[PDB]
Amino acid sequence: AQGTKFRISLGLPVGAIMNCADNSGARNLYIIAVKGSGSRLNRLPAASLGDMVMATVKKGKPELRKKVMPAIVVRQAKSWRRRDGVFLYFEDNAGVIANPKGEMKGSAITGPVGKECADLWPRVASNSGVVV
Template identity: 50%
Template sequence: MGATKFARPRTSYGLCNGSRILIADNSGAKIAQIINVDGYKGRIRRLPKATVGSVCTVTIKKGKPELRGNIVKAVIVRQKMIYRRLDGTRLCFEDNA
């Protein structure tokens, strides 16, 4: 089976269910927890994992009182775990966001 036009390159999954991430926008939320990874096709009893570019469902854990506890969608933009780009460079950040 060849790669399709829309296939994402395989990157290291650095975040799983329950991981806490920083919020990188100005909405007032500070920290969120991943509760689901949209589109993750895994195995039975295996926790969904996310990487840079994954769309996740998160719950807000710390921030403005009116946002705390809300369930929202988020995109992973940074991860601590090293991942490799298609051109061979390796990249990691100091936080998960």
């Protein structure tokens, strides 16, 4: 379900509590796995900017909690290399929640969204106010 993305550095292992970017009621998301990750003995699977992860709500509305639902990383604090040359990194991690088809439940996203996340997912680029 995921299109082609150039490799960027892995900055969110399993267990990372990242912020929640949209206004769907949640406050933070707890990454438990990454769609399309690999397999190695004692290696933790990790997420990057633009990956689809499975994530649970630890704080927010009581309707959303205690169930697993997929989500999309939109910001990242670990620096990655763009092909034009500059190394960039945001201030904090963030994630919006979505269905497994990729459509977003949220209405609008606060703060900026990474550019390589906007090209990879169409519905994220609709809700995005600021793209980098």
